[PDB]
Design a protein around this ligand. Structure first.
Ligand SMILES: CCCCCCCCOCCOCCOCCOCCO
Ligand SMILES: CCCCCCCCOCCOCCOCCOCCO
Ligand SMILES: CCCCCCCCOCCOCCOCCOCCO
Ligand SMILES: CCCCCCCCOCCOCCOCCOCCO
Ligand SMILES: CCCCCCCCOCCOCCOCCOCCO
Ligand SMILES: CCCCCCCCOCCOCCOCCOCCO
Ligand SMILES: CCCCCCCCOCCOCCOCCOCCO
Ligand SMILES: CCCCCCCCOCCOCCOCCOCCO
Ligand SMILES: CCCCCCCCOCCOCCOCCOCCO
Ligand SMILES: CCCCCCCCOCCOCCOCCOCCO
Ligand SMILES: CCCCCCCCOCCOCCOCCOCCO
Ligand code: NA
Lengths: 210, 210
C-alpha cells in the first residue's frame, strides 16, 4: 500500500478558460494492494483560483472548484502491457456535475519509453442535459535516467474538438519530486465572437509518495 | 530539514461566513534548520468552497479563496520555552488583502501539556484603510499518550470583538495523522439585520510530516 500527494501552481497567459490568471490543482490518494495490481482511490481539487479574475470576452469569471473523487483498478496483462478501469465523479459547489467512467491502457518499454491512453466519459449530471463528451489523454514519457523523466501529453475532447499540448520535465529524486510543465491549451475553443481562447500555462508542481 | 502537508474538510451548519456549506483549508510548508531554530516557509489555501453556496442573509456567496504565503523564524530559548516571529501575506484573486506580521510564544511541558499564543496583525492592504485588527490564537494541548492528543484553541479578534472555539482530537499514529475538530466560529459577528452569524462546523483533517 502507499499514499501520495501531488499538486501545482499554474500561471496563465490569457486565463479566460480558467477564469483567472493563476490557478492550482491538488490531489491526494491511496493505492490499496490486491493481487491484480493496485486499487487506487483519490480526490482532486481542480481549478482553485489564485490570480486576477478573467471575466470578459469569454472568460469564466469567479468559478467554484472542480472536486473529483475517483477509484481505479489496474491490471497487468503482460509485465509491460497494462490496462485499468475506473470511475470519477465530478462535484462542484455541493452538486453533482458529471459522471465520469474512464478506461486506460499503456505499455512500458525497457529503454524508458512508456505509452498510455486514458479515455474518460463526461456525462452531464446537471440540468443542462448536455451532450456526452469524451476526453482522451495520450501520453509518451521518457525516463532518460533515474534523475529526470520527460513527457508529452496530448489532451483531446472528441466532441468539442479541442486540444491541449502538455510538455513536462520531472526531477525524479528521492522524496519530493518537483516538475515543470508547459501547457498549450484550448486549441479549437472560441468565444461568442469567434475569437480564440487558446491559453498558455506555466506550471510548477511536486509529487510525493509515502 | 522537514516538509509537511495538512488539510481538512469542514461541514458547516450555517455556511454564511464561508459562503458555502462545505469548505476545505489546505497547507504545505518546509522547515530549514539554522542557528536560531526552524525557519519555515509555507502557503495556505483557506476557504476553498466545496458545498452548496450560502448567499442569503449575509452569506458571502461565491468567494475566491484566501491565499497565504508566509515565513517564520522560531527560536528555542529554553528546552521548553520557544518564540517565533515572521510575516504572512494574504491575497485573493490576484489582489493583496492584508499584510500579516506575526509573533508566537509557547511552552511545552514534559507531562505533555503545551501552551501557545500567536498574535497576528491584520493590516488592511486594500484602499479601504480599515483599522488594523489583531488576531490571537490561544491554544492548550494535551498529549495523553503517543496515540491521541487533544487541544483547545481560542481565536479572538481584538477590535472586531469576535471569537472562535476549536476543540480537537488527533490520532498521532505513525504516518498520516488524522484528526477530528469541532469549531464554533464568528461569535460576535452580525449581518446587516443584527442576526448572529455564528457557524458550527464538523472538521475532518489530516497531517503528515517528512
Ligand atoms: C483533505 C483534502 C485533500 C485534497 C488534496 C490534498 C492537498 C494537500 O496539499 C496541500 C497543498 O497546499 C497548497 C499549496 O500548493 C502548492 C502546490 O504544490 C503542490 C503541493 O504538493
Ligand atoms: C470510489 C469512487 O466513487 C465515487 C463516489 O461516487 C459518487 C457517489 O455520489 C453520487 C450521487 O449522485
Ligand atoms: C466503472 O463503473 C462505472 C459506473 O458507471 C456509472 C454510470 O452512470 C451514468 C449515469 O448517467
Ligand atoms: C474528501 O473529499 C471531499 C469530498 O468532496 C466534497 C464535495 O462533494 C460533496 C458535495 O456534496
Ligand atoms: C484525432 C485526434 C486524436 C489525437 C491523437 C493524438 C495522439 C498523439 O499523442 C502522442 C502520444 O501518444 C501516445 C500513444 O497513445 C496510447 C498508446 O498506448 C497503447 C499501448 O499499447
Ligand atoms: C538532472 O536533474 C534534472 C532536473 O530536472 C529539472 C526538472 O525540474 C524543473 C522544475 O522543477
Ligand atoms: C453541530 C453543527 C455542526 O455540524 C454541522 C453539520 O452539518 C453537516 C452534517 O454533518 C455531517 C458531517 O459528516 C458527514 C461525512
Ligand atoms: C502553523 C503555521 C506556521 C507553519 C509552522 C511553523 C510554526 C509551528 O509553531 C507554531 C505554533 O502554533 C501556532 C500556529 O497557529 C495556527 C497556525 O495555522 C496555520 C495557518 O497560518
Ligand atoms: C476579562 C474578560 C474578557 C473576556 C472577553 C475577551 C476574551 C478573549 O480572551 C480569550 C483568552 O482566553 C484564554 C483561552 O485559553 C487558551 C489557553 O491557552 C492559552 C495559553 O497561552
Ligand atoms: C484540551 C485538553 O487539554 C487540557 C489539559 O488536560 C489536563 C490534563 O492534565 C495532565 C494529566 O496528566 C498529568 C499526570 O501525569
Ligand atoms: C466537543 C465536541 O462537541 C460536539 C458539539 O456537539 C454538537 C453541537 O451541536 C449543537 C449546535 O447548536
Ligand atoms: Na469562487
Amino acid at each position: 500500500g502507499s499514499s501520495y500527494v501531488t499538486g501545482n501552481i499554474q500561471f496563465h497567459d490569457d486565463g479566460r478558460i480558467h477564469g483567472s490568471d493563476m490557478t492550482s490543482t491538488l490531489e491526494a490518494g491511496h493505492t490499496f494492494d490486491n493481487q491484480f495490481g493496485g486499487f487506487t482511490v483519490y480526490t482532486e481539487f481542480d481549478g482553485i483560483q489564485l490570480g486576477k479574475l478573467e471575466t470578459e470576452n469569454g472568460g469564466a469569471g469567479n468559478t467554484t472548484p472542480a472536486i473529483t473523487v475517483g477509484g481505479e483498478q489496474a491490471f497487468n496483462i503482460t509485465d509491460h502491457l497494462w490496462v485499468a478501469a475506473g470511475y470519477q465523479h465530478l462535484f462542484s459547489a455541493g452538486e453533482s456535475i458529471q459522471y465520469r467512467p474512464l478506461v486506460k491502457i499503456g505499455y512500458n518499454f525497457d529503454n524508458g519509453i512508456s505509452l498510455s491512453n486514458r479515455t474518460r466519459a463526461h456525462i452531464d449530471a446537471t440540468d443542462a442535459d448536455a451532450k456526452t463528451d469524451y476526453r482522451m489523454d495520450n501520453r509518451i514519457g521518457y525516463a532518460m535516467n533515474e534523475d529526470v523523466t520527460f513527457s508529452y501529453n496530448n489532451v483531446y475532447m472528441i466532441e468539442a474538438e479541442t486540444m491541449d499540448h502538455e510538455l513536462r520535465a520531472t526531477w525524479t529524486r528521492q522524496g519530493v519530486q518537483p516538475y515543470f510543465e508547459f501547457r498549450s491549451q484550448a486549441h479549437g475553443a472560441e468565444n461568442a465572437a469567434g475569437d480564440s481562447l487558446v491559453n498558455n500555462a506555466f506550471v510548477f508542481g511536486a509529487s510525493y509518495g509515502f
